[PDB]
Amino acid sequence: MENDKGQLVELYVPRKCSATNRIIKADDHASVQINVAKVDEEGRAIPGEYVTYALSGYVRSRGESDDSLNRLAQNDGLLKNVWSYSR
Amino acid sequence: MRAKWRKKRTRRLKRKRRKVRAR
Amino acid sequence: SLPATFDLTPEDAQLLLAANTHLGARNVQVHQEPYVFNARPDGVHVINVGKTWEKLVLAARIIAAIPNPEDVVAISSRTYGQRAVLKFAAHTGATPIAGRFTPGSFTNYITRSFKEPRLVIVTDPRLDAQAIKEASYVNIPVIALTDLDSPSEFVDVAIPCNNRGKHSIGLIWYLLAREVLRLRGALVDRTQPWSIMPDLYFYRNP
Amino acid sequence: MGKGKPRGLNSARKLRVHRRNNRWAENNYKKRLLGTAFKSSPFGGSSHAKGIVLEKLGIESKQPNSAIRKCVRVQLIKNGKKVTAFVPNDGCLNFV
Amino acid sequence: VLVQDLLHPTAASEARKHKLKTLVQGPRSYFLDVKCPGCLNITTVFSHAQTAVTCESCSTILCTPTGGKAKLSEGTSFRRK
Amino acid sequence: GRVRTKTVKRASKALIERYYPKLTLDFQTNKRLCDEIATIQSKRLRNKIAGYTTHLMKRIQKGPVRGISFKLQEEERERKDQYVPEVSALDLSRSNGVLNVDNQTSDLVKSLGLKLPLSVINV
Amino acid sequence: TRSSVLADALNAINNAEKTGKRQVLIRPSSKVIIKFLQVMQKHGYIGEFEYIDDHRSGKIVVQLNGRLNKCGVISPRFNVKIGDIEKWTANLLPARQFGYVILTTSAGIMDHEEARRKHVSGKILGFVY
Amino acid sequence: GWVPVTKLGRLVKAGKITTIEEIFLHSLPVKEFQIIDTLLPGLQDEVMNIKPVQKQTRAGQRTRFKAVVVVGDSNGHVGLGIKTAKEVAGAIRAGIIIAKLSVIPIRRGYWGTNLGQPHSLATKTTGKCGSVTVRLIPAPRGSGIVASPAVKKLLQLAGVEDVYTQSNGKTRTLENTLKAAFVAIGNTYGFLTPNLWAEQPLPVSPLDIYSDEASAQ
Amino acid sequence: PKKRASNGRNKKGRGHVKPVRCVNCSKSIPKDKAIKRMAIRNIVEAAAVRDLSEASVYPEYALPKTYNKLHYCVSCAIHARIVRVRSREDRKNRAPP
RNA sequence: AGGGGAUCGAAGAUGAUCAGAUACCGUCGUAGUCUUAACCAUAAACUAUGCCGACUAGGGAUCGGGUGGUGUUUUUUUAAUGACCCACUCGGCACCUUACGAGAAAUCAAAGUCUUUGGGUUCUGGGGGGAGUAUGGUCGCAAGGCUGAAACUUAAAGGAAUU
Ligand SMILES: [Zn+2]
Ligand SMILES: [Zn+2]
């Protein structure tokens, strides 16, 4: 990645899944990035202001993407009393 | 050619060789 | 955090449990499974209405985030959500696939039925598995209106509802149309529940 | 998940004896060890041999081909086994 | 599932999980300080007896041994621990 | 072997979905409609096309039949869609028959909901 | 019987981190297991782990960060010498930069990087990428 | 005269998707070869195999020509294309467009002692297809490419300088070799190393930035 | 290859099933493997019952049925019984008529 | 070797068919055991999948146990129950239905955790024939069983799926 200097020699620093930390690949289709709208006081949200949550093809396929985003939503304050930690 | 009747043929000529050799 | 006025109003709660969104819920269940509220005797389940409502608000935030209106594709191949998605599409410009899905819709860029959504809203993951499966090939998020025993595969944000009466499907579609039209739209007040009869979403029998 | 073979640190006896046995199934090993070259093999397990030619022979080629292969039957000076050698070019049967 | 925290698990699950297959090995048996129908005593008995335990005065058969938890003698009072 | 092919059965469907008026349940008129409106090559192709438009026009006048929805029938479906006459009642705001709830949905709204007039039943 | 306990502990951690889970339960939990987990923890392949002290061998609940790719044991503890550590860290690891082969050295449970800086050797326990 | 469907095409034609890794960054399914044509001008365009494949018919045997081709840069991008056409002159073309579309990045690294740009692979990668299983064991500097001549120039067009290989299975089968070699080259990005352990913010998709500059009006 | 996940059979948990003679072939076949089908029929055919009843004593004509489980070997069954050898797809469909 | 021998049936008799058919079909029919004692020790002896152990993902059903039903039956007064049944729950069982990993594929609860190769351990194989043959021991009343080669020969033989 680095030359033991400056000059970072690493193109496409890949973006990790938000549920597993697993690197999403360049050809990893079924790897969605959802943008949730940042709300204003009681109604509208800012057009162009988001919170961007990535979920990788593996977590989506497994069928634990609803549960993974439920926890991430509660832990960024998008939901409340939905993902109970200890099932 | 049947791996049974092949085997039986071998097992017959073995017995008839025993009876030939007992002489 | 949210501004914390969207807190399940009693007119919405009584609508949901008059539609029987939770009073059925498939006695035999799938082990996810946090959207449960102590299954009733005589073999039936009862869903958390607070949770499905919270999920509905999250779903609205994602749909409302989608900047161009008609890159949200509202799909319902089953009879009980046909006009529900047609009205959802007409209200908040969201091109519907109410009917047969015609596989090779999101893949197969040549066909005349070619759409490139940045979001899919599916009334049933089982009966519209083709829409979900096709979305998985081209990196599309999917918002489902699932039951308890519905499959969760290749499906993010699921709104837990009922899929037996038709009243649920009609209502939860109206409510999602309602909540999205509030955020950056012509519904200028959160209160006053915008009483356009939630029977413009009910599949009227012949 | 043991992969059949033993994986003890004190199993060098077994791991060696198992190869010593199962090496026999190899072709090169078996004939180098039993010395097949020195019992069979008219050459007695050597490169060349010398001999005195008994007969000129016309061996018929195998079925997809058709020809007379102009061999020579020759008794080996070395041991006394009679082998059949091929004459390796066009008009060389007339030369031998 | 994917995220649980099995250090702090829920009692609605720990109640149902097997005697051994819980967070720590712990028995679901207990002791009954059960009182005689006749000569009032405080005889300690076990959930899953294995013996036809009697009172001290006469052989008044307090329990009958069964496959699991033992039976009681038609009329008596029990107190757990 | 009097089966009509796609070359006539498609032309017929295009013809009816455009000129539903100017088509009158009669071969002898529909024949001359096709003479004027279409540029059909053979006289016998016309007769087959016109004969099948007439067959469709007879079948469409016993209630709309699936496959052929014309520019008028689309406006009828738009009115039955929008002007749905199931708007006299609220409906679904069934303060008379929501409130026939059972003890589990009672405990449900008790936990999360504000307050509702709830008619509790059992099993 | 179960012949080794580090084996099934490291396997269980691998089987969970395959599915991208965020915690594992290890039943047997020896001191050797805890010390291996501590060396994993140091380089940051592992979060925190609790040791539940059931009056027995006890159990562990480890918490993962999805960084650990491979995490295995070498079952027969081969008597390694510092002259031939390079033959192991060339055969087990992805090239040279990262990953660690774990020695049960006399000085204690360590990696090849640490064992080199000390100039000591022992046996081999396993590895982590 | 491209006139692109697929709004990815509309963005890259307009000259907005800069060059070129935002497609790889966001896993954007590219389905137009004229995208790669605009982004990367310098490619080859290097045919590997043309084998006759024969379906037996009622009368006679119909022979197609399954063309395997590698379309790669000289830097960090390779693509493998296998298409069965009725003619070899059309086969190479119909292969090339797939070998362009399925272009993939390689994660080049070091064997320690950085001193300049990456020469080898970053880590020991493997890839499998059928039985043929290829390994790419990164090698010391100036050793050259130590592969079979089939995959040798696949790794040259990838841009790799130094690499040992340990290909096991029926390696003669060329399609299955290159397929497995192309999986192995692709699996480089997909190894979570402490080099790229740092949690960075997720960038917003240019389908969500130029939302209404795509979808032709 | 292996054609069936079963063995055209049931025997799973057992070592040996006591065999059964085919109804027509006489071929002995293990019971579990034998194609069993209950032949339940009216004693009198579905054409004669009119003249049967009209010429019978005891009105209400109970008309008792006949019951016998036909055990068939595989080859005797393939002779146009309910077998009609189906595709490698439809082989797995267990549902009877 | 003793009983026993009804049925069915190697051998054999015999009628058909056949060009021949000492076979397939028909009628008879010894030996044959079904039984007691003593042998033999092989089977497509098969799940063609060694065992002990750990982890990775819906429904019935066998056995045991725990709760719950104001369910049925229960009458000797209300039933003390008990059983059968219903729901939830585990432990073990014979399984089965959908599937991200694996495999050449057919395919699968293990055939997964395998070039990112190591939980313990036993047995077996190294192209096809020759050949499970010869030989030598060993056991057996015999039939045979166990172990078990080589000369020479050959460019394929084989597995799975496709047209
Ligand atoms: Zn006293
Ligand atoms: Zn039969």
Side-chain angles (χ1 to χ4, degrees):
Chain A
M1 188 192 73
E2 275 276 65
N3 307 140
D4 206 341
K5 311 200 312 179
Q7 296 296 315
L8 177 127
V9 283
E10 179 75 70
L11 286 315
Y12 161 48
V13 45
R15 38 156 199 157
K16 299 150 59 192
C17 181
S18 300
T20 61
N21 268 4
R22 285 202 160 194
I23 289 181
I24 72 95
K25 307 163 66 197
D27 60 326
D28 194 334
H29 304 327
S31 180
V32 311
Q33 175 195 308
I34 93 171
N35 309 294
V36 152
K38 276 233 197 72
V39 81
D40 256 41
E41 273 279 22
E42 298 164 30
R44 312 103 186 73
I46 307 102
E49 213 72 39
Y50 304 120
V51 288
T52 165
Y53 271 145
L55 280 151
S56 67
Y58 179 68
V59 190
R60 302 210 51 246
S61 72
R62 279 254 52 197
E64 296 161 52
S65 188
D66 59 347
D67 200 70
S68 280
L69 182 47
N70 273 355
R71 93 173 176 76
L72 286 176
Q74 254 199 218
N75 285 244
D76 258 43
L78 314 174
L79 295 178
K80 49 183 211 308
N81 202 68
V82 190
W83 170 75
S84 173
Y85 188 12
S86 68
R87 180 164 290 158
Chain B
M1 82 90 189
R2 181 158 147 158
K4 206 189 217 204
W5 312 142
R6 169 71 283 286
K7 162 162 177 178
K8 185 189 279 285
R9 188 199 259 166
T10 269
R11 194 228 49 229
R12 268 171 173 155
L13 61 78
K14 250 168 46 169
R15 174 162 39 191
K16 208 141 57 181
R17 171 136 31 74
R18 259 188 293 264
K19 295 153 62 188
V20 153
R21 190 169 171 181
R23 166 166 57 82
Chain C
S1 192
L2 267 153
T5 60
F6 277 160
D7 311 312
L8 181 51
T9 71
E11 62 258 42
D12 290 319
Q14 77 193 53
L15 272 165
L16 286 178
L17 299 151
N20 305 18
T21 305
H22 315 283
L23 323 186
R26 263 66 178 254
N27 44 9
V28 304
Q29 199 178 241
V30 156
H31 270 142
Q32 329 163 31
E33 193 52 281
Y35 320 94
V36 179
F37 218 139
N38 211 320
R40 193 199 83 178
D42 210 48
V44 273
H45 273 266
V46 40
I47 310 182
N48 192 306
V49 188
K51 272 181 188 182
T52 182
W53 201 87
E54 293 258 24
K55 288 255 57 186
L56 219 165
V57 184
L58 174 54
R61 294 260 286 287
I62 307 158
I63 296 172
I66 318 307
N68 195 53
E70 43 72 48
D71 296 29
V72 191
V73 174
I75 315 175
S76 61
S77 55
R78 219 204 312 168
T79 63
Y80 284 164
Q82 293 183 165
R83 63 154 307 115
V85 295
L86 291 183
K87 287 295 306 195
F88 182 90
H91 289 314
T92 167
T95 180
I97 321 188
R100 164 172 173 74
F101 178 71
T102 168
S105 313
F106 310 149
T107 38
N108 189 16
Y109 60 84
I110 294 302
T111 182
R112 288 187 259 184
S113 185
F114 183 57
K115 314 160 196 72
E116 321 182 49
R118 289 175 291 170
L119 194 49
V120 161
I121 329 294
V122 43
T123 207
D124 197 314
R126 185 168 303 284
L127 281 142
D128 311 15
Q130 189 52 241
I132 294 161
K133 175 50 75 176
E134 223 159 83
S136 76
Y137 287 98
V138 276
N139 299 252
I140 287 159
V142 267
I143 318 186
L145 315 183
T146 51
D147 211 316
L148 294 196
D149 79 331
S150 281
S152 309
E153 311 280 288
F154 282 102
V155 167
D156 59 292
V157 45
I159 305 167
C161 76
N162 189 53
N163 287 297
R164 284 205 283 177
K166 98 197 182 72
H167 290 253
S168 171
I169 299 109
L171 178 53
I172 315 305
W173 262 119
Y174 171 77
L175 297 186
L176 185 47
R178 208 267 304 283
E179 300 275 54
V180 63
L181 267 163
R182 291 179 162 162
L183 197 153
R184 185 37 265 173
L187 302 175
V188 196
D189 53 338
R190 271 199 170 180
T191 181
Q192 218 277 50
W194 183 61
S195 61
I196 170 55
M197 300 68 154
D199 295 297
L200 264 170
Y201 285 66
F202 280 23
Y203 181 71
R204 50 157 283 174
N205 264 290
Chain D
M1 306 195 319
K3 246 199 202 159
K5 67 170 79 75
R7 278 234 218 286
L9 200 67
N10 303 22
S11 296
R13 161 158 26 255
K14 201 89 159 42
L15 253 64
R16 200 153 63 80
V17 170
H18 212 62
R19 195 120 322 292
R20 285 208 294 95
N21 288 6
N22 289 19
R23 272 205 92 182
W24 282 116
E26 294 170 291
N27 229 307
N28 275 210
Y29 177 89
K30 168 163 270 205
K31 63 137 163 277
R32 220 198 328 106
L33 252 288
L34 296 196
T36 313
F38 273 85
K39 318 292 198 161
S40 197
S41 300
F43 280 26
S46 69
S47 177
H48 294 63
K50 209 161 290 298
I52 327 160
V53 298
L54 298 170
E55 320 221 331
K56 313 268 206 68
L57 278 175
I59 306 284
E60 304 171 44
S61 291
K62 268 179 184 162
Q63 193 42 61
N65 300 325
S66 192
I68 305 305
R69 274 289 94 95
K70 307 312 190 300
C71 304
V72 58
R73 192 200 311 156
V74 57
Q75 190 181 45
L76 288 199
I77 282 281
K78 180 174 198 159
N79 45 22
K81 298 188 168 177
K82 290 169 188 183
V83 297
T84 163
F86 174 84
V87 192
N89 255 351
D90 202 356
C92 292
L93 184 72
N94 305 332
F95 270 133
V96 182
Chain E
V1 42
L2 205 131
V3 207
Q4 250 181 316
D5 192 1
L6 220 60
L7 286 168
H8 331 309
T10 211
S13 305
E14 302 327 82
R16 312 204 216 172
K17 279 175 188 184
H18 191 231
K19 192 178 67 181
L20 294 131
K21 288 156 179 53
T22 165
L23 186 49
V24 317
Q25 283 88 305
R28 304 204 177 285
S29 75
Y30 49 91
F31 283 86
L32 254 55
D33 303 330
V34 53
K35 297 130 289 169
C36 202
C39 186
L40 252 200
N41 303 313
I42 200 169
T43 316
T44 300
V45 304
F46 188 54
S47 299
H48 319 259
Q50 296 184 18
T51 326
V53 64
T54 58
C55 86
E56 44 164 315
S57 295
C58 41
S59 299
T60 324
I61 325 104
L62 186 280
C63 278
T64 291
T66 54
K69 298 170 175 176
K71 273 295 171 198
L72 308 174
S73 308
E74 253 271 30
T76 174
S77 308
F78 39 61
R79 276 168 197 157
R80 292 189 57 158
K81 300 165 183 73
Chain F
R2 313 93 176 146
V3 156
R4 287 80 138 197
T5 76
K6 71 186 57 174
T7 309
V8 315
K9 197 167 303 196
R10 281 184 184 168
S12 172
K13 252 151 195 208
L15 209 138
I16 288 200
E17 280 197 46
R18 294 187 180 193
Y19 308 88
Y20 184 78
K22 293 289 300 165
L23 265 182
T24 52
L25 261 85
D26 174 29
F27 165 71
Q28 294 291 320
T29 52
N30 291 14
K31 175 172 38 168
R32 297 290 183 204
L33 282 161
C34 304
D35 272 340
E36 185 143 288
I37 72 97
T39 330
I40 309 175
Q41 276 284 83
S42 110
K43 186 215 210 153
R44 159 186 161 116
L45 231 196
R46 169 200 76 186
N47 295 322
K48 286 176 162 198
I49 278 171
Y52 196 75
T53 63
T54 295
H55 183 222
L56 282 192
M57 285 297 301
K58 186 199 301 304
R59 189 160 65 91
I60 206 68
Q61 266 201 352
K62 197 165 292 308
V65 279
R66 216 175 77 269
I68 177 132
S69 189
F70 38 100
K71 64 166 170 285
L72 175 130
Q73 183 185 124
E74 201 277 335
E75 294 153 17
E76 193 276 299
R77 302 236 162 207
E78 176 267 333
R79 278 186 293 192
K80 200 152 286 156
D81 169 56
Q82 170 230 27
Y83 281 167
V84 49
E86 315 310 322
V87 291
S88 173
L90 275 139
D91 205 332
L92 187 65
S93 294
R94 287 269 184 76
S95 181
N96 198 151
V98 147
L99 300 142
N100 304 347
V101 168
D102 285 32
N103 55 85
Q104 292 280 27
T105 291
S106 168
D107 299 354
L108 160 59
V109 295
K110 160 250 274 170
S111 78
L112 44 96
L114 171 87
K115 176 85 72 53
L116 302 164
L118 205 91
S119 307
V120 184
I121 336 188
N122 190 279
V123 169
Chain G
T1 329
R2 52 135 57 78
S3 191
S4 168
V5 283
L6 181 51
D8 50 61
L10 293 195
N11 182 265
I13 297 158
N14 231 312
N15 277 74
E17 196 40 80
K18 273 182 212 306
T19 83
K21 291 230 191 89
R22 298 318 219 82
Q23 67 293 313
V24 303
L25 180 94
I26 305 168
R27 181 158 78 250
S29 72
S30 83
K31 182 213 157 182
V32 200
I33 292 185
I34 292 164
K35 288 286 202 178
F36 201 103
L37 284 151
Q38 274 188 14
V39 177
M40 286 208 251
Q41 196 156 84
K42 181 38 140 275
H43 294 299
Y45 292 100
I46 282 303
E48 304 87 341
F49 50 97
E50 254 294 341
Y51 162 71
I52 71 95
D53 195 356
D54 170 47
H55 289 324
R56 255 146 292 197
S57 72
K59 316 168 190 191
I60 296 168
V61 168
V62 190
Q63 293 154 72
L64 314 100
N65 47 21
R67 282 159 143 173
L68 185 89
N69 313 102
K70 199 69 200 84
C71 158
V73 67
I74 310 308
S75 159
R77 306 203 168 123
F78 283 14
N79 310 141
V80 68
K81 325 204 194 203
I82 22 171
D84 71 89
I85 274 181
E86 322 98 340
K87 296 205 308 170
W88 278 94
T89 181
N91 279 16
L92 277 197
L93 302 198
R96 294 204 79 264
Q97 317 331 307
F98 72 100
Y100 298 99
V101 284
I102 305 300
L103 307 325
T104 175
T105 300
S106 40
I109 296 187
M110 291 156 174
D111 56 63
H112 71 271
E113 162 70 302
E114 206 266 30
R116 271 171 185 165
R117 287 190 275 91
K118 285 205 163 195
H119 184 74
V120 297
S121 187
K123 309 185 158 204
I124 319 165
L125 280 177
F127 60 101
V128 276
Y129 276 25
Chain H
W2 181 13
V3 58
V5 77
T6 309
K7 65 192 65 164
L8 253 178
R10 293 179 178 98
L11 293 163
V12 301
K13 176 155 194 186
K16 312 255 64 170
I17 305 314
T18 51
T19 26
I20 83 105
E21 293 94 336
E22 209 182 13
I23 315 177
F24 300 143
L25 244 172
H26 311 339
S27 310
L28 302 179
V30 68
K31 312 204 72 55
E32 279 197 322
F33 84 93
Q34 307 92 326
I35 298 176
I36 278 76
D37 203 342
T38 300
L39 292 170
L40 311 170
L43 286 135
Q44 285 144 50
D45 132 74
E46 203 70 17
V47 317
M48 221 58 50
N49 222 342
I50 296 152
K51 56 141 54 164
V53 306
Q54 303 205 19
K55 189 195 166 198
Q56 187 75 283
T57 76
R58 166 154 265 279
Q61 57 203 349
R62 194 220 49 237
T63 76
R64 313 180 57 75
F65 315 114
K66 193 178 77 75
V68 193
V69 68
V70 165
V71 177
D73 293 27
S74 310
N75 284 235
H77 313 269
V78 239
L80 187 70
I82 295 157
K83 189 122 223 309
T84 171
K86 209 199 194 313
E87 306 145 20
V88 308
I92 57 99
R93 286 187 182 178
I96 273 170
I97 70 98
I98 299 194
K100 280 189 198 168
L101 282 176
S102 300
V103 63
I104 214 60
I106 53 153
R107 204 236 178 182
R108 304 189 278 178
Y110 301 95
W111 183 74
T113 169
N114 305 328
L115 248 170
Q117 281 71 228
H119 48 90
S120 196
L121 298 213
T123 68
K124 295 190 177 195
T125 334
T126 210
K128 189 170 194 311
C129 170
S131 197
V132 172
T133 319
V134 179
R135 190 199 192 121
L136 286 181
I137 5 173
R141 206 192 202 100
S143 74
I145 312 190
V146 206
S148 320
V151 320
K152 196 175 189 300
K153 77 157 152 301
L154 181 138
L155 296 170
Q156 290 188 4
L157 297 205
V160 177
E161 322 185 10
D162 298 292
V163 45
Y164 300 132
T165 82
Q166 212 172 121
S167 185
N168 154 80
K170 203 179 183 304
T171 64
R172 308 195 332 166
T173 305
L174 200 55
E175 55 98 10
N176 273 5
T177 289
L178 291 189
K179 265 171 143 61
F182 195 68
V183 169
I185 239 183
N187 289 357
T188 57
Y189 284 111
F191 221 132
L192 185 60
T193 74
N195 208 344
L196 301 180
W197 257 12
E199 212 297 317
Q200 301 195 1
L202 315 188
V204 176
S205 179
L207 274 76
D208 285 319
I209 303 289
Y210 313 130
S211 297
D212 264 24
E213 295 174 4
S215 291
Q217 308 170 20
Chain I
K2 191 164 207 308
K3 205 167 167 212
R4 301 160 168 85
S6 176
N7 283 312
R9 207 172 180 172
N10 265 316
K11 200 195 62 45
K12 268 180 172 183
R14 290 152 285 287
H16 171 263
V17 184
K18 196 81 83 169
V20 141
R21 303 307 222 116
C22 173
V23 155
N24 37 343
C25 190
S26 166
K27 181 179 223 308
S28 74
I29 178 169
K31 179 172 180 174
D32 57 346
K33 199 193 201 317
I35 293 161
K36 292 153 268 74
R37 263 146 63 205
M38 247 286 160
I40 281 178
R41 279 177 151 165
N42 303 352
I43 277 175
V44 187
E45 50 170 307
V49 86
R50 282 183 158 188
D51 276 56
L52 199 87
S53 45
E54 82 91 35
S56 167
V57 203
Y58 315 128
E60 204 73 359
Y61 311 110
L63 198 58
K65 305 192 180 168
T66 189
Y67 320 73
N68 48 310
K69 173 173 283 199
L70 293 163
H71 313 271
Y72 286 130
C73 76
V74 185
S75 33
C76 269
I78 303 288
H79 266 227
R81 252 135 290 278
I82 311 304
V83 278
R84 205 62 50 93
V85 45
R86 343 112 127 185
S87 64
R88 75 167 315 97
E89 176 59 289
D90 289 359
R91 275 197 194 114
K92 293 167 280 169
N93 292 14
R94 298 285 188 176

